[PDB]
Amino acid sequence: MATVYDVPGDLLVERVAQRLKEIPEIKPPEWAPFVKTGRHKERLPEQEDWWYYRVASILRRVYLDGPVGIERLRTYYGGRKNRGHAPEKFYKAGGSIIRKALQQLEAAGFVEKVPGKGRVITPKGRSFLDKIATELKKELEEII
Amino acid sequence: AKPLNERFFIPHEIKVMGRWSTEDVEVRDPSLKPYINLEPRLLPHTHGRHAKKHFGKANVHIVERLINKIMRSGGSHYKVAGHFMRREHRSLNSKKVKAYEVVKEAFKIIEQRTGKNPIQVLVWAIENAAPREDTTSVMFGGIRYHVAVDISPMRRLDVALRNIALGASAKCYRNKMSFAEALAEEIILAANKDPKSYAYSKKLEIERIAESSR
Amino acid sequence: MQKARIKIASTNVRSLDEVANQIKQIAERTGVRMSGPIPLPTKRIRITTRKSPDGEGSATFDRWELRVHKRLIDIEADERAMRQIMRIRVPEDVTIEIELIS
Amino acid sequence: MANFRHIVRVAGVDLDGNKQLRWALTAIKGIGINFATMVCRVAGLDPFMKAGYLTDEQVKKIEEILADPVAHGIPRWAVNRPKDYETGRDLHLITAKLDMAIREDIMRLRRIRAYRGIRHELGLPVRGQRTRSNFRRGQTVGVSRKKK
Amino acid sequence: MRIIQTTGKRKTAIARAVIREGKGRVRINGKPVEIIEPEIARFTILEPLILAGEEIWNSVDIDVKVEGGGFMGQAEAARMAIARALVEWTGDMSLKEKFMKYDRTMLVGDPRRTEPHKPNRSTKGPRAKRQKSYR
Amino acid sequence: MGKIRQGFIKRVARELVNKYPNEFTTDFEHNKKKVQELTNVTSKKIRNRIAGYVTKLVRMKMEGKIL
Amino acid sequence: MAEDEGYPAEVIEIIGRTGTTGDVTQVKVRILEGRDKGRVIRRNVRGPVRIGDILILRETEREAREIKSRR
RNA sequence: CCUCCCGCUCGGGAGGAGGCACUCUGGGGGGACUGCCGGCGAUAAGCCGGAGGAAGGGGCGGGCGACGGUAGGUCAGUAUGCCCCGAAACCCCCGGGCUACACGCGCGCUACAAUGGGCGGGACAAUGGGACCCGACCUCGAAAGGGGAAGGGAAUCCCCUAAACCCGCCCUCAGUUCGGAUCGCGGGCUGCAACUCGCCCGCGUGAAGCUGGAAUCCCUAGUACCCGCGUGUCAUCAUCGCGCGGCGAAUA
C-alpha cells in the first residue's frame, strides 16, 4: 500500500541504496569516485553510499518523468563553480556518473530505453521500488 | 528525523515550534499584556503584514519580532548552496527563512539548560532588557535640555529585544558562540538581569545616565 | 469536407475582436459546423529603453508594449465555403492564417 | 586507531600534523587536497580520520605513489604536470620539483626577451589586465607565491 | 458523497483544493503531507485542522495542488483553502467566526502581491538611487 | 497624503440636483443609474463620485442650508 | 528587582507635542496607585502612546511643561 | 472503462479513454462613492474614529512635468548657420594603441566562516527569449564540448535546472577545509586570427583581508533587507543596464 509518493526522501534513499548493495547487480566502478567526479568537490569522498545515492535518485526520477535525458540529470543536481569575484553561476554535473548509471540500471533491468527516444521504468524497476516503499511507509507509523 | 515528526504531532495540539505549549507562561504585568503576542498561536513567519496601521506592529508574535531584529545586518552580496554565504551574516544579510532556524535552535539551547518552557525565559528577558527611563537631548523653545522622558510599553519591548539582538553579535563575532547559542546565553541572562548581558548593561546605564540628567 | 484552422492575430484590441465576432456570425448559417473563437495568449513584447541621448544625470527610461493577440478558430466547411467567409474587410493590420487538413 | 603519533614524517623529512590526513598533505608543497584523496585510495586508508594514526608501513605506501604517480593509476589530467617542456610525458611535482620547474620556465623567458618574463619582473599580472590602480593604497598582490 | 471545489491564493501560490468524503487523505501536489522537509510550514497548514477538530479531518478526503513558488508560499495557499474547504462543508457561522477571530490569513488573501522594479537612475532594485559624494 | 473632491465633480453634481431634483434619492446606485443617462460617462470611477456628491446634496437640502 | 515605587498612571488626554527632535509628546495622566490616587500630572511621554495607555511613573514629583498651540 | 506497480485486500499512485470542472488565457461587465454610522470642525469644506466587506477615505503602482533657467549637456546620432581641410584634418590597408601605471578618487561586485563547508536526498516559480536560432533525446568525452537527431516561426516544443529552503551524514573555529589573487601546465570553444587582450574545465600553486578613522550615501511595505531567474545589446569581453518571481521586516 505504497508508492515512492508516500515515503519522505530522507528515509527512502538509504533503503534503496542498501538494496543496490544487496541485490547485488549495480556496484561502484573504480574510475567514477577517483577523479571523474561532478564539477568541483571540496573533498572527494571514498563512499559506496556516494555511488548508491546518485543511482537511488535515478530510479525515483524516471518514475516521475517520461523521456528523462542525460542533459536533464546533469542539470538536476544543484551546485556551482567559482569564476572569481564575479559571483558564481549555475553549471551541470559530471556526465560520466550519469551515463554509466542509467547503463548499470539498464543491464539490471530496472530502466529501459523506450522506442520514442528517452528513458522509462520497467516493471522490475517499478516493483523493486513499491516493495522498498511498502517497507518504509509501514515503519513510519510504528515510530513516534 | 523521528523526533522531528513528534515535533509535528505535538504543535498541532497547540504548541510553538513543535513542543512549547503557549499556556505555560502568563503576562503578570497589565502593561505588557496588549503589547505582546504570547496569547495567540502557532507560527512566527506568518507574513501577516505589520506597521499597516497605528499599532499594526504590537500584534506581532514575540518570536517573529525576535526573528527580524535578529535577521537585521545586510548588504548587496549573494548566498546560494554553491561555495557561497555572508550574504546572510552574523545576522541575516538575508532572510527570515534561515533566521527562523537560529531562534528555534536558541529555544532548543535555552530549554536544554534551564529546562523551563523557553517562552517563559524570553518573555522574562523582554520585561527586564527594556530600560524604564531614557534621556533625549531635547530642546523645546530653543532651549537645550537633556531631560526626563519616561518609556512607553511599545518602545520598551523594542529596546528590550533590540539590545538582546545587538549584544549577541558582538559575542558570536568569529567565536564559538553560534547565534543559536550566543542568543540562547543572552536570553537566559537578560531574563535573570545578570551582570553578563550586554542587553541588561544598556537598560541600566540608559536609566542611570537619565536619572542624573533629570 | 476539410477541417480548417483560421488563426488570426492582431496588434490591437479593437481590430481583432470585430473580425473574430464577424467570422463566428457569417459562418454560423450555411454548410459550416464551427467551434468557438478561442483566445490564446498576448505575447506582450517588452522593449525596455534608455530615453536620454546623453545617458546623463538621471535618465528616465521608457517601457514599451507591443501586445499581439491571437484568436483561433476551427471550422468544418469546404475550400469554397472558406473564401465566402474570407470575403470580409479586415483591419489593416490583422493576420489571418489558414491550415488545411481532412 | 593504528598507533597514535602527533608527528609522523611523510614525503621525506617534512612534517605530517594532527589536523586530518587530507589537510596535512595539502601543506606539503606539490600534494594538494584533491591529489591527497587520490593517493588515499591506491594506498587503502580511511580519508576522514586524524593524521598521525599511522604505523611505519603506511608511510612507505605514500612515498612510492608520489615518486611516479602515473605508474599506479592517476589520470593524465589528474596528475600534477602532464606533457612537460615538450618531451617528458608526465612527471611528479613536490616542494623541490615545483620550485625549480616554475623558476626554470621563468629563467627561460627572460633570455627569450618575451612579454611574459619581464612582465613577471616589473611587478604585474600579464593577462589579468588592470595595473591602473589595483594593489591600492601602497598595497601589493605578492605575485607568486607565499607571505605566510 | 460530495464535490465542493474552492480556491486559496496568497503571494501567487494558487492552491487548487477538493473536499470529498472518505478516510483521512491529505494530498499535496500528488504526495502525502509527509514528503515536505521543513517541519515549520507544515504546522502552518495544520493550524486550521485542529481549530475545527481531528473529527472532521479524519472523516474527509482533502486533495490540494498548490502551484506556487514558495515553500511557505505553498503552505500559506494551503492554510487559506482547507479553512475555506471546512467552512463550506459544515456550513455554520461557528467555524467561520472562530477562524476570523484567530487570524484573517485563513479567509482573506492580500489586497497586494508585488511591485515592479522602477527604471531608476542606473542602479539595482525598484527603490534605490546611485550613491552620491559630489559635495 | 490628503483628500478633496475635484471642482468638475461638484459643478456637475450641483446642476444635476438643480434641473431634476425629485428624480434623485438617498440610494447610491439609483442616482448612479440616472447620472449615467443625463451627462457623459467619460469613465466609471468619476461616475461613482458625482453620484457620491449628489447623495450628500439630497441630505443637506432637507436640513435647510445647502452649499 | 525591588519596586522603587511603581506609581501607575493612566493617560487621560494627549495635549500635543514637545521636543525639537519632536520626541516627547506631552500627555496628561491620572494616577491609580495605593499612595496618592487621582493626581493630574502633565508628563513627557515618548514613543507610541494612545488614549487609555498605562505608564509606570519613576518619580511622583515632576510635571515639566511648555504648551502652545493650535490657532 | 482500460494498461502498469504495490498491498495488510482496507486501500495509494501513473498512463490512455473520457470530461471541460479547476488553474489559466484575454475581451467585456460589476464592486469603493465619505454611501451609512459617531466625533472634531462655521450644521459648509475637510480631518479623525466605527460597522458591514475581497478591497477603503489621494485603495494601491506607473505613465502623464506649465511659462522658463543653469548661455547645463550633445554640432562625435541625425537635422543645421558659420568657418577650416583639399594626395591632405581626405582615402585604403596591416600592425599597434583605447586593456598602458608609483599613485589619487567615484560607482559597484566578491569578502573577512559554524545563522558554516562537503556529500546526498527531497519540495518548490515567474518575466521572458528561441531559425544558420532554442535545442528534446541518444551516444563518445573527466569536463569544457563533440557526433548523431525529434519538435518548434510557438498557451500545444526548447532554453529549464530556480535559488534561498529543509533533513541526515562527514567535518570541528585556524588566516584555516576561510578567501580566492598570482603563477606552471594539460585542454575546449568562436572567428582569418583571442601574445598584447576572451571565457570555461581539470591538476598543481594559494596572495591581501580576521569587521575597517575622519567623513558620507540610500530608503518608509509586499517596500527595504535577502535569494536566484530572464532579456537587451549580442560570436566573444556583463562584477553592467532593463525586467521577474521566491523569503519577508525596522522606524517613522
**Measured in angstroms, what separates residue B52's CA from nucleotide H23's C1'?**
31
Show the cell assigned to B38. Answer: 504570547
| Residues of chain E neighbouring B17 (CB-CB closer than 8 A) | 40
Q: Give the Cα separation of B102 and B92 in Å (integer).
A: 10
Residues of D in contact with A96 (CB under 8 A): none
* DSSP string for A93-135: --HHHHHTHHHHHHHHTSEE--TTSS-EE-HHHHHHHHHHHHH
Helices A9-22 + A123-142 axis angle, to 10 = 130
Name every chain A residue with its beta carbon within 8 A of the beta carbon of B6: 144
Nucleotide nearest the Cα atom of D103 (by C1')? H184
Q: Is cis: bond before B73, omega within 30 of 0?
A: no
What angle in degrees, to the nearest 10, is found between the helix axes of B179-192 and B118-125? 70
Q: How many angstroms away from the CA of D38 is the closest CA of chain A?
A: 6
Query: Is there a contact between A8 and E34 if contact means CB atoms under 8 Å apart?
Result: yes
The beta strand positions in B146-211, using DSSP E, are 147-150
Residue to mutate among E25, E26, E28, E31, with most A CBs inside 10 A, is: E31
Report the half-sphere exposure of B111 (CA within 13 A, side-chain side): 13
In chain E, whose CA is at the least distance from the CA of B37? E102
Kindly determine whether residue G56 and residue B31, on different chains, have CB atoms separated by under 8 Å.
yes
Residues of B in contact with G49 (CB under 8 A): 152, 154
Residue A141 CA to chain centroid, in angstroms?
26
CB contact under 8 A, A46 and D40: yes
Residues 47-76 on C with a CB inside 8 Å of E are: 57-61, 63
Amino acid at E50: I
The DSSP symbol for B61 reads B
Beta strand spans in chain B (E): 15-16, 20-21, 133-136, 147-150
User: Diameter of chain A by CA atoms?
Assistant: 52
Residue in chain D lying closest to A41 (CA): D34
Q: Could you tell me the end-to-end alpha-carbon distance of chain A, in angstroms, rounded to an integer? A: 20
Please indicate whether chains F and C are in contact, defined as at least 3 beta carbon pairs under 8 Å.
no
Strand C38-42, strand D15-16: pairing = unpaired
Cis peptide before E32 (omega within 30 of 0): no
Whether a cis peptide bond, with omega within 30° of 0, leads into D145 is: yes
What whole-number distance in Å separates Cα of residue D57 and Cα of residue A72?
A: 46
Number of H helices, E strands in chain A: 7, 4
Name the one residue in this structure whose C-alpha cell is 587503502.
D44
Cell 592517476 found at: D74
D94, exposed or middle or buried, with CB in 10 Å at 0-12, 13-18, 19+? middle
D129/D127 Cα distance (integer angstroms):
5
E strands, chain A, where? 80-81, 89-90, 111-112, 120-121
- CA dist A10 and A7 (Å) reads 9
Facing residues of G9 across strands?
A: G31, G55
Give the three cell numbers for residue D107.
Answer: 629563467
DSSP H helical segments within chain D, as ranges?
A: 21-26, 34-43, 56-67, 69-72, 95-112, 117-122
Angle (CA) B157-B159-B165 rounded to 5° is: 100
| The dihedral sign for the CA sequence A135, A138, A142, B2 | positive
Distance CA A75, CA D70 (A): 32
C-alpha to C-alpha distances, E73 to B100, D81, E77, nearest whole angstrom: 16, 52, 6
**How far is B45 from B57, CA to CA, in rounded Å?**
14
Distance of CA D121 to CAs B45, B154, D109, D132, Å? 58, 66, 11, 17
In the structure, how many helices (H) and strands (E) does chain C have? Answer: 2, 7
Are the C-beta atoms of B110 and B131 separated by less than 8 Å?
Answer: no
Q: How far is Cα G22 from Cα G45, in angstroms, rounded to an integer?
A: 11
Q: Is the preceding peptide bond at C93 cis, omega within 30 degrees of 0?
A: yes
C-alpha cell at D9: 614524517
| Closest among F34, F41, F42, F40 to F17, alpha carbons compared | F34
**Would you say B135 and B208 are in contact if contact means Cβ atoms under 8 Å apart?**
no
Residue A11: list chain B partners with CB under 8 A: 1
CA–CA gap between residue A21 and residue A108 (Å, rounded): 13
Instruction: Please judge whether E102 and B40 are an interchain contact, meaning their C-beta atoms are less than 8 angstroms apart.
Output: yes
**Within 10 Å of residue C77's Cβ, how many Cβ atoms?**
20
> What are the Cα distances from residue F66, in Å, to E64, F22, F54, F57, F62?
58, 16, 12, 7, 9
The Cα D34–Cα D38 span in angstroms is 7
- b/e map E76-112, b = 16+ CB within 10 Å: bbbbbbbbbbbbebeeeeebbebbeebbebbeebeee
Q: Give me the torsion for CA of F18, F21, F26, F29, rounded to 10°.
A: -80
Nearest beta carbon to residue B42 from set E11, E47, E72: E47
Contacting A residues, span 60-79, partner chain B, CB-CB under 8 Å: 78-79
What angle is formed at CA B197 by the lines to CA B191 and CA B203, rounded to 5 degrees? 80
If you measure CA to CA, which chain B residue comes closest to A89? B82
CA nearest to G60, candidates G69, G43, E57: G43
- Asked if B138 contacts B149 with a C-beta cutoff of 8 angstroms, the reply is yes
Please, which residues have CB within 8 angstroms of residue B26's CB and are 6 or more apart in sequence?
none
Q: In whole angstroms, give the CA distance from residue B15 to residue G55.
A: 32
Q: Is A20 exposed, middle or buried (0-12, 13-18, 19+ CB in 10 A)?
A: buried
Instruction: Give me the helix-helix angle, B62-70 and B118-125, nearest 10°.
Output: 70
The nearest CA of chain E is from the CA of B202 a distance in Å of 34
Return d(Cα D115, Cα D135) in angstroms, integer.
21
Question: Method used for this model?
Answer: cryo-EM
Nearest residue of chain G to residue B151 (CA atoms)? G46
Neighbours of chain F (3+ CB pairs under 8 A): none
Q: What are phi and psi of C8, to 5 degrees?
A: -125, 120
Distance, CA of E132 to CA of E101 (rounded, Å): 49
Rounded to the nearest angstrom, the minimum Cα separation between G54 and chain B is: 6
CB atoms within 10 A of CB C10: 24
Q: How many CB atoms lie within 10 A of CB A9?
A: 13
The dihedral built from the CA positions of residue D32, D34, D38 and D44, taken in this order, carries a sign that is positive
Interchain CB distance below 8 Å, B83 and A88: yes
* CA–centroid distance for B11 within its chain: 21
Exposed, middle or buried by CB within 10 Å (0-12, 13-18, 19+), for G33?
Answer: middle
Q: Which of B54, B151, B211 lies at the smallest CB-CB distance from G47? A: B151
Question: Which nucleotide in the DNA or RNA is closest to residue D85, CA to C1'?
Answer: H185
The CA–C1' separation of B112 and H51, in angstroms, is: 49
Please report, for residues B81, D100, D122, the alpha-carbon distance to residue D117 in angstroms, rounded to integers and kept in the order given.
Answer: 40, 16, 9
**CA triple B30-B36-B39, angle to 5 deg:** 90
Please say whether the beta carbons of E70 and B97 come within 8 A: no
Strands C95-101 and D8-9: unpaired
- At C21, list the grid cell: 465576432
Residue pair E40/B100 in contact by the 8 Å Cβ criterion: yes
Give phi and psi for D60, each to the nearest 5. -80, -35
Interchain contact, A144 vs B9, CB within 8 Å: yes
Numbers of helices and strands, H then E, in chain F: 3, 0
Which is it for strands B20-21 and C38-42: parallel, antiparallel or unpaired? unpaired
Q: Which residues contact A41 (CB under 8 A, 6 or more apart)?
A: D34
Place of cell 535552535: B105
Written as one letter, the residue type at D120 is H
Whole-number Å distance between alpha carbons of B139 and G22? 9
By C-alpha distance, which of E63, E51, E42, E64 is closest to E103? E51
Cβ contacts of G31 on chain B, cutoff 8 Å: none
Torsion of Cα atoms, D63 then D68 then D73 then D78, to 10°: 100
Which residues in D47-80 are b (16+ Cβ under 10 Å) and which e? Answer: beeebbbbeeebeeebeebbeebbeebbeeebbb
The phi and psi torsions of F5 (rounded to 5 degrees) equal -80, 140
Chosen for mutation from E115, E118, E122 (greatest number of chain C CBs closer than 10 Å) is: E122
The answer to whether B41 and B138 have CB atoms below 8 angstroms apart is: no
Read off the C-alpha cell for B140.
523645546
Which bases of chain H are under 7 A from a protein CB atom?
Answer: 4-8, 10-14, 21-28, 30-36, 43-49, 54-65, 72-74, 77, 99-129, 135-145, 149-150, 154-155, 159-168, 170-187, 195-208, 210-211, 216-230, 238-252
> CB distance from B6 to chain A under 8 Å?
yes
* Partner E contacted by A3 (CB < 8 A): no
Provide CB contacts within 8 A for B86, sequence distance 6+.
Answer: B77, B79, B93
Handedness of CA F6, F11, F14, F19 (dihedral sign): negative
> Does the distance separating the beta carbons of B12 and E43 come in below 8 Å?
yes
- Whether E53 and E22 have beta carbons less than 8 Å apart is answered as no
